[PDB]
Design a protein around this nucleic acid. Structure first.
Lengths: 96, 79, 49
RNA sequence: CGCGGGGUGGAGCAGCUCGGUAGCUCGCUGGGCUCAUAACCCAGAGGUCGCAGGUUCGAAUCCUGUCCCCGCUACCA
RNA sequence: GUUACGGCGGUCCAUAGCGGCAGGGAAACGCCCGGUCCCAUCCCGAACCCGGAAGCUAAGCCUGCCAGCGCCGAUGAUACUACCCAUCCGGGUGGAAAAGUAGGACACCGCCGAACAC
RNA sequence: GGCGUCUGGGGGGAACGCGGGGAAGUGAAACAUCUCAGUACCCGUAGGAAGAGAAAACAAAAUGUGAUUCCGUGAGUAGUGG
RNA sequence: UUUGAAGAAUGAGCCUGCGAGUCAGGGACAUGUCGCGAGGUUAACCCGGGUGGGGUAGCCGCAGCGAAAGCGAGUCUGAAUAGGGCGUAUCCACACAAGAGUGUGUGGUGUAGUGGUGUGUUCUGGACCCGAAGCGGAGUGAUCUACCCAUGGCCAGGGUGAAG
RNA sequence: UCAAACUCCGUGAUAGCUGGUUCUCCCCGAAAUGCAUUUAGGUGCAGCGUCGCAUGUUUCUUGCCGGAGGUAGAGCUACUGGAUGGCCGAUGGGCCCCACAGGGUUACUGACGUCAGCCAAACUCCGAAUGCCGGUAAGUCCAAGAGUGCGGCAGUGAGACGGCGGGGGAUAAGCUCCGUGCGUCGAGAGGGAAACAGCCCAGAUCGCCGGCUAAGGCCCCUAAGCGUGUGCUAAGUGGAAAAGGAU
RNA sequence: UUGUGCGCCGAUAAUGUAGCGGGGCUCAAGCACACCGCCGAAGCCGCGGCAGCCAACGUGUUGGCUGGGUAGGGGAGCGUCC
RNA sequence: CCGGUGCUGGAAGGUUAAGAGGACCCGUUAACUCCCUUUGGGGGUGAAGCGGAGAAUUUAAGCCCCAGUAAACGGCGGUGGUAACUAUAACCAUCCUAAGGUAGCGAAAUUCCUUGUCGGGUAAGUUCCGACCUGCACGAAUGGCGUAACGACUUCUCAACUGUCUCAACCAUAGACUCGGCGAAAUUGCACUACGAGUAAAGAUGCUCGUUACGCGCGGCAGGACGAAAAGACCCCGGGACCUUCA
RNA sequence: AGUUUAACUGGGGCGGUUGCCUCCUAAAAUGUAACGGAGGCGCCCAAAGGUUCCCUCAACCUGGACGGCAAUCAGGUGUUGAGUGUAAGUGCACAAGGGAGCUUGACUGCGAGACGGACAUGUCGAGCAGGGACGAAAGUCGGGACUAGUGAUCCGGCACCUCUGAGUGGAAGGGGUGUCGCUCAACGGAUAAAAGGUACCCCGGGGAUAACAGGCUGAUCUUCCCCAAGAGUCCAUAUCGACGGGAUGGUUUGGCACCUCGAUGUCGGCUCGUCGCAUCCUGGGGCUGGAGCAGGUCCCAAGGGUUGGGCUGUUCGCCCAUUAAAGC
């Protein structure tokens, strides 16, 4: 109605967007424990196969759920909780 | 001709927001006022704009104390 | 020029800022007033002209 | 239809509020020059822009009714 | 436990106040005596503070007497009033119900302490 | 410059193409930036297609791809914008 | 169309025909339905005389918070274990803290989207239909009319009577 | 055809403007308000409708209880102001003693104070009723088809009259502007009011050559009573009207 | 002389009675107070039909409540053509 | 009247673009180096070159400025007093101006008041003529005052003339009327389209209560059908167009 | 050449206004409109903030040198009438009023919960921490007794930041935090940037809105009337009838804006009339300060009649002659 509209009387949201952003497709250790009840080698290809992450994507692993099984996880990044849970189960957490 | 009047301020919505018996949380505005037509008492505090707010839960109790009209908050004893 | 201007009281020992207002017809530019800064604690603040 | 607008010594004009209003010319009064005006000297004298109100301490000064001759008043069909 | 009592409080902070006219000094409250000390006066030991105990309940404080001034104050009635009835009557119903007036209402309650009692 | 001779052009054509020129209504609830729109229109030119095209390119540290054009995505994103 | 019209407000002479929410888009939102399902789906394109079969590039879901670096069921702020914001699908049970509104841990249950398609709104488009005055581009027009150029023609009759 | 020709094209120009928008039935059902607006005849959002989902009586009504208000009314010697008459009498004006002061005295003004009676939207020592907030117990409760939250879809955002309270206006307007869990029309037929959207009665599912009623009416028009009883009226009052006049 | 219930005057426009809707009404068909009946609606009831919501019971009947309606929302349908 | 705005001329100054000018500064880093410990890595300085930001200084017109110009656009005053009756004011004082409207004209094609006043003309003259000047709001090339002649101009008067009129009558012709023939039109919601007083969207053929009225035509009149025509041109809102300008 | 040139508006224009705060209107919650009634704001204060402590005025009376009503001094009365930075209101004497000392909380990070609420805005806020001020301590302090004292967004500037750094290291630029720049005052702020005319006008619309007429109202106007102070030699009422008061009518100027703006043609005249009576003449009558003639005033009466000319567009009016009269 000529009132200064909501999309102009409000401030533009702060900040920028960082075109050089390294975004990671994330998978949780609980999802891993469900996908691989027996354990074993676990890599980006296997996670893509089991439908946990997307192809052609950097992968990060996160410690949300419970992990009980031995896994030689291979991803691009790991969180501390994820790494610790993996090693507590007794497997390994390799970064490429 | 013309009138030199025509102005008015915005209504400030002063008044009593929580009357006697109304159970209120702490910080609840009880009384919006300019001066101290209502004074603060038990578990009630006075803001910069002479607004009365509960400092604790309870039911609002309107009382008097040395002629002043007061606003008090009486505790609600849990069962 | 206004009598009561912005002032922009800055700090000694680190030149960060607090802002308030003060009349120009006071016979000075130097409103030395203590204040709490971030990154340090209570110190004297002056008005950078 | 309706609106608008300055006032101050006797005359004409100035002067916006640090706490007085006043000043100029003319006029007038007294004296002097002259045998008797004008021009000279002043002790020169001279006013509350009317009352109400200031935030007033106090308002010519500021604000309103009044103070009132005021330039513009103009409903176009 | 009793005081003509000293504090600390309370009341829909006036039924409590003011002003009476007659009284009290046990401890206490007080005036009061002095400024050496802490402290103090935009000047003043008046006050604040300190040290004291000469005399005095004169005052404050306290007790009794009160409708003199103020305060409280119903009832009933009236006004006003939500709803209702009523074709103007702002009439009337049933509900609520003032102000003013008038009749009448003159401090009380608690805790501690003191002297005494005990 | 004149004379002679020879070779050719000239104009048309619905659309598409390349290069140039280039509006305004409109929208922005006004309007000028902006948009409409490089549209309409115009000009010059073609060819059966044209243009472009064989890196003084992309890319980002991958032993990378390897002319150009076109299609889809990227994405109504990054950004741009009184 | 109006507060309100039989209305003396509008429109309609009558009949017959025609005459207005449509279409496109992997568009947006919501809803229904179908398929599959933590996956769903292909686009261009290829092969098919078809409506079928291939096609993983991408897209949406699958982890969020933060300006971002980044960290990650946490994260941002912040000196903070000190609170708040957003998020941790939801619910159940227990336990402990609290009764400042309830929270924190443990266990369990375990999260539902996506692509077709219908419908309703919506975006870009003429966008339900009709309607201007007017703006712009390019052209047509001076055989009407205005003015001018060239060349021709016309102005009965009667008077007045300048210069020379 | 000329305050910028005509034609074609852009072009289906754009128009907050006007008009038009075609079959049916069932259920529900508004608004004409607020805020903002180069806005005021438009639009956004809210309010109000519908649909769906979730919740479920939280809504609403009544009783009771707890509460805050400053209206009506009243009061003012309770404030600010206004204001009547008395009383006193400063104060001044005069007079006389006549200076100048200090005195008495007044044809006068006569403040302040006081006695009595009064007034006020911007006065209040007071102070309702209502309404509002909250709580509580019930009611309705095969329904109000409630309320709240979310979302889809809206329309409305020109209101009108009447009752009550009020402003503006001449306490005029079929005036205007507000308020009112006030109404009706709007969007509501039917009956009455002669006719007559907004007044009264009453909210139309359809049918019936059945009955009771409301408002309003019962001599004839016109259905029902030239009803009964007691009075009144002489003016056709009834079946318009004032100050005021009136054996 | 007081108050009251009815009345009188004041009273006064212009197409035509025209300020009871009309006739006509005081032998009230006028006013007041009481009383008695009746008329009177698409209200309520009665009989019947239909629909919506809900409930109950049964795997479709009964019952209750509701059913004016503009903008508008929702639902279900008729008809036309291919 | 050169104050304003223009136009012309001038340029001692002031200001002023691009261009020259490139200081200084910044970025980078060859090299110096300092710790910090690492197996090299974080702080300072910093040449040249390349870049970026670009100061001082110089630089024209224009503008400011200095003069002129009004047959350039334009502008050409107030207050108060004063003469032996009164009246006015030749005269004076004062304020402001760039200058204060001269001659001449003047209730005007200009004068609101206003039918100004006076005179003339008329029986009677808001018009006309002459004159006065109190010029709301004349005025000298947006020319002033006059002017013979001219004018389908405007205004007034007079003679003559007349049907313009008192006051209308008659004749013919073309229509209208009748017959024959051809044969439209605008308009149109309908229709066996009364009047009064009312009521009503406030002016009724259509409603109410009454009154009046046999049905159908022909010629006529024009009061109504808020008659037809043209989506009011005035007004407003919205939008255009064209025009103006120190937007 | 393209465009702008606001809206509200009891039609529009002119005038005025536009945001914020306070009161009344406002109908005892909140809220509530009007070109309704009154005022104020677009700041100030480095103390006029914070804290600790202390005090209580104004007015009046009395006494006092200049000194006066009123300066400062003393005493008394005085519970609030003063004063509160500034409008008003609400409050404040318990002080929020007056004074002194020390100070900078006129903080940083946050904020349970609320108010208000179309949205955007706005408002209060106990409490935790940090580091402080005051205070013995409790505690208070995140500006002011309160409510106004201000401006969204975009854009850009400055300072700081362990953010980013278009191959890499840097840098530029961007980003965060704090903050600055708009009488954008038409104050929810169309553009960074904008005035007018149209009678040459056009289009779309409107009876949503004016002019004519109608309708309502009836201030005004008109026609009467009530009281009767009085003028009238006396005598209120033969006649006029003040101050005041009540009404008619609906013809005047108006108010409203209800039909009509997809058309209701306007003044005056001409023609034709028709109606009312508030009667100009004619007619009838009462009173008279009516001797008579002639009148005045009032009542009844609307049958008929109610001239022609000069001026002016004119209605109206003045004038000329007449008339029984020259009606409204």
């Amino acid at each position: 109605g000529g009132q200064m509209p909501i999309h102009m009387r409000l401030p533009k949201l702060k900040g920028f967007k960082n075109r050089f952003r390294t975004e990671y497709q994330v998978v949780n250790v609980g999802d891993i424990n469900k996908a691989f009840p027996q354990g074993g080698t676990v890599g980006v290809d296997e996670l893509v196969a089991k439908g946990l992450v997307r192809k052609n994507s950097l992968v990060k692993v996160l410690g949300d759920g419970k992990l009980t099984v031995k896994v030689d996880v291979t991803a691009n990044k790991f969180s501390g909780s994820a790494r610790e849970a993996i090693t507590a189960a007794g497997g390994s957490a390799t970064e490429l | 001709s013309s009138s030199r009047n025509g102005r008015d301020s915005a209504a400030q919505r002063l008044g009593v927001k929580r009357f006697g018996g109304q159970v209120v949380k702490a910080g609840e505005i009880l009384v919006r006022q300019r001066g101290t037509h209502f004074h603060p008492g038990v578990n009630v505090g006075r803001g910069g704009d002479d607004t009365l707010f509960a400092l604790a839960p309870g039911a609002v109790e309107f009382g008097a104390k040395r002629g002043r009209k007061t606003v008090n908050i009486v505790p609600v004893a849990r069962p | 020029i206004r009598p009561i201007v912005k002032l922009r009281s800055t700090a000694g020992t680190g030149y960060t800022y607090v802002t308030r207002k003060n009349r120009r017809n006071d016979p000075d530019r130097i409103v030395l007033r203590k204040y709490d800064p971030v990154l340090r604690r209570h110190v004297e603040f002056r008005e950078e002209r």
